[PDB]
């Protein structure tokens, strides 16, 4: 059972409450904005109170449209646990702090900072392909190419397998993997979000205009969003050599860009190998305080100002755009510009003297043919596709094409098979005895989890079937045991280290790779690793070989399965 709490235009509340038999699952506890209007918050609270006590709040990505009502759902104490991906968790740390910061500047409050940290106490995190067993439901995440940490949620209940798509990323995405990862198994229901734009890589055109303008004697101001989009246009400046410099005048946008480069393992495979080489190179020069911002705005030698206030509404893109609006320069609108925003008036002339060019390649969501392609990759045809968000218009034309593919649509304003994931026994039942007033029978066999049916089949069945039929390093199991024992005796590997590495391994393999890479990262300004220093009389060459031994020993343990890692690590640390 699924409820769409405000799933029409995500203004004043949006949630997907999966009503399974044991849990009140919530997907995408988020809010949009109308850029100006007070009673809004009362309709939000009424929706939130109507949700009820949600057993698990699951965030497909980290935008406020998907994660904006989460600390309000902790203030009313309706949320139990907050599961997402780790990059999503730190992104909503910055986004909830910024949301409240604007409420304080708006003179407000929907939630408070205590609600934010109280959200991040109950916030469990798992990465892609990590099935976790919560309250009759096996929940897995799969990448959907939208932003860093964005996934689609796969919930296998006994009443059906649901795939909340979230936002599917476009083909113009360079930082992420392009093919959106999917369940290998069934999808009884797919909760799909429609598009917002229209169907074309301008890309190079950016580097064209910014060429011609910078040689003309004018800096290029590129307004952008702070989630992904600034890093998209900075990555297109990182790829092709642009001889004049780039400058980020965005504090939040810069610390999100750093948050890209510690979480490079969650980005595209071709960029996961980025070796003590930065991915954005060292081409980006970051403005830190307001005084370099003022000096750079006053400075007039042509250079990219590539920063993020969004849509010319408040931030440091503003302090640049005032003198640029007084100027040879140009504004490059690589994002959509919403209603009632000052930059929409700049994009509609109502007059910026410097040149107006918008670019439509840098889009976050996908296309109509990409939502079709998202649909056709599926191993089985879905039973029903619940188009939920988008503009109403393109929801109708996508709905018409997906009816043409002869799969069924439920629009939210226009919104009954039972799918029992049955368990059945295929073994002899007659030969049973009694010991403690229990009709029992010892049996040995094979459980076979087949799509839509868990069966318990004998040795005869397995006979019939068998008769018919990252780039992690590698080292042997005994070498792993020897090296962990030796680094434990010299106090490099500790019980807090093994506990924390176990927490990131139960988090998922790529989070543990990030943890060991972050610990073994020598800071070039100091020379310090986060490894525990060893006890003894080791010199600096030997201390460096032991740190590399710890790096290559906690890697290549990651490659093993969970049980093997627990059986190795339970000897050195008896508590997990």
């Amino acid at each position: 059972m699924i409820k769409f709490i405000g799933g029409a235009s995500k203004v004043t509340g949006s949630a997907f409450l999966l009503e399974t038999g044991n849990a009140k699952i919530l997907i995408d506890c988020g809010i949009e904005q109308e850029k100006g209007i007070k009673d809004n918050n009362e309709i939000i609270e009424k929706k939130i109170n109507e949700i009820g006590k949600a057993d698990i709040c699951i965030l497909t990505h980290a935008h406020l449209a998907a994660s904006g009502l989460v600390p309000l759902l902790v203030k009313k104490r309706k949320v139990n646990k907050i599961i997402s991906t780790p990059a999503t968790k730190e992104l909503c740390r910055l986004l909830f702090n910024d949301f409240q910061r604007i409420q304080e500047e708006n003179n407000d409050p929907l939630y408070s900072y205590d609600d934010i940290e109280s959200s991040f106490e109950i916030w469990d995190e798992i990465d892609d392909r990590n099935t976790i067993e919560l309250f009759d439901t096996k929940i897995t995440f799969y990448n959907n190419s939208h932003i860093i940490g964005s996934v689609s949620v796969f919930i296998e209940t006994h009443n059906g397998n649901y795939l909340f798509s979230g936002d599917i990323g476009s083909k113009l995405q360079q930082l992420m993997d392009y093919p959106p990862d999917m369940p290998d198994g069934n999808v009884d229901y797919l909760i799909l979000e429609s598009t917002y734009g229209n169907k074309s890589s301008d890309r190079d055109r950016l580097l064209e205009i910014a060429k011609t303008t910078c040689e003309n004697g004018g800096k290029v101001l590129i307004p952008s969003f702070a989630i992904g989009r600034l890093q998209e246009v900075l990555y297109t400046f990182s790829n092709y050599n642009f001889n004049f410099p780039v400058y980020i005048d965005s504090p939040m946008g810069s610390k999100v860009t750093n948050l890209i480069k510690e979480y490079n393992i969650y980005l595209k495979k071709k960029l996961r190998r980025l070796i003590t080489d930065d991915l954005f190179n060292n081409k980006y020069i970051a403005i830190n305080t307001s005084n370099q911002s003022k000096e750079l705005s006053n400075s007039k030698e042509p250079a990219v100002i590539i920063s993020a206030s969004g849509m010319l509404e408040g931030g440091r893109i503003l302090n640049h755009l005032e003198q640029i609006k007084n100027d040879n320069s140009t504004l490059i609108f690589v994002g959509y510009q919403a209603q009632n925003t000052r930059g929409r008036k700049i994009l509609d002339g109502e007059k910026v003297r410097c040149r107006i060019e918008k670019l439509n390649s840098f889009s976050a969501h996908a296309d109509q043919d990409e939502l079709i392609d998202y649909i056709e990759r599926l191993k089985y045809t879905p039973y029903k596709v619940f188009l939920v968000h988008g503009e109403k218009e393109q929801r109708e034309i996508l709905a018409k094409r997906i009816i043409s593919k002869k799969i069924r649509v439920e629009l939210p304003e226009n919104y009954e098979i039972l799918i029992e994931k049955k368990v059945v026994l295929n073994i002899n039942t007659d030969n049973m005895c009694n010991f403690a007033s229990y009709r029992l029978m010892p049996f040995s066999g094979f459980i076979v989890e087949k799509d839509d049916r868990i069966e318990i089949n004998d040795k005869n069945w397995f006979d019939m079937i068998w008769n018919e039929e990252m780039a992690l390093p590698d080292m042997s199991h005994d070498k792993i045991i020897e090296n962990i024992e030796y680094l434990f005796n010299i106090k490099i590997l500790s019980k807090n280290r093994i506990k924390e590495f176990w927490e990131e391994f139960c988090k998922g393999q790529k989070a543990a790779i990030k943890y060991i890479t972050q610990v073994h990262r020598k800071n070039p300004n100091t020379g310090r690793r986060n490894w525990n220093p060893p006890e003894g009389d080791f010199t600096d060459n030997e201390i460096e070989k032991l740190y590399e031994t710890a790096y290559n020993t906690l890697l290549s343990l990651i490659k093993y399965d969970k049980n093997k890692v627990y059986n190795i690590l339970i000897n050195f640390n008896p508590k997990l």
Binding site: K53, R77, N80, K81, I122
Partner: protein
């Protein structure tokens, strides 16, 4: 007889709150993780005994006032049946008129129960000898109970309210000496009809 007192008791938590897990299987399941589990339900909610705390409170204060109240806290002590607390909470002959429920929490463990660390500082070297992890209930956690007196006289309101004030003084359950269990109570009392449910 024809009337019956309903005392809706709303308890807020001020200091941390501990009440130990009483079920064997639930406790031994939690002793792989925490050494002092909070007394919890199977619906994931915090269960606190409330009748014995009220009886102990009223017993101590009525004994200090000078009333002829038996001490049922002594080991296998028989209640006589003529005390005020025998009429309220119970005697051997007759049951109590007051049927106190457990303080059922209004939230569900994962929002109010936290795993904490307590120690034993060695007094001369100022290091930690023992380290034990115990579960506790956060402050501001809301608990609900109802006290249903079957045959009300006039004192059964004020005696319960006085015992509640004593529970604000000494604490409701668990480690009352280390400062745990300090709570406040709000009382909504009504005298219902016994024949209310008969249509």
């Amino acid at each position: 007889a024809k009337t019956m007192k309903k005392i809706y008791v709303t308890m807020k938590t001020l200091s941390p709150l501990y009440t130990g897990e009483v079920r064997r299987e639930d406790k031994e399941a939690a002793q792989k993780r925490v050494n002092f589990p909070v007394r919890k339900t199977a619906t994931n909610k915090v269960l606190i005994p409330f009748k014995g705390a009220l009886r102990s409170a009223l017993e101590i204060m009525l004994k200090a006032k000078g009333e002829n109240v038996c001490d049922t806290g002594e080991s296998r002590a028989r209640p006589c049946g003529r005390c005020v607390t025998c009429s309220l909470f119970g005697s051997m002959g007759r049951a109590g008129r007051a049927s106190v429920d457990f303080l059922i929490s209004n939230d569900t463990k994962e929002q109010i129960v936290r795993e904490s660390t307590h120690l034993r500082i060695e007094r001369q070297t100022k290091s930690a000898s023992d380290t034990f992890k115990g579960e506790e209930v956060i402050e501001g956690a809301t608990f609900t109970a109802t006290i249903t007196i079957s045959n009300p006289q006039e004192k059964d309101l004020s005696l319960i309210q006085s015992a509640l004030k004593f529970i604000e003084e000494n604490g409701i359950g668990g480690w009352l000496n280390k400062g745990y269990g300090r709570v406040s109570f709000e009382v909504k009392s009504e005298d219902v009809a016994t024949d209310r449910f008969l249509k």
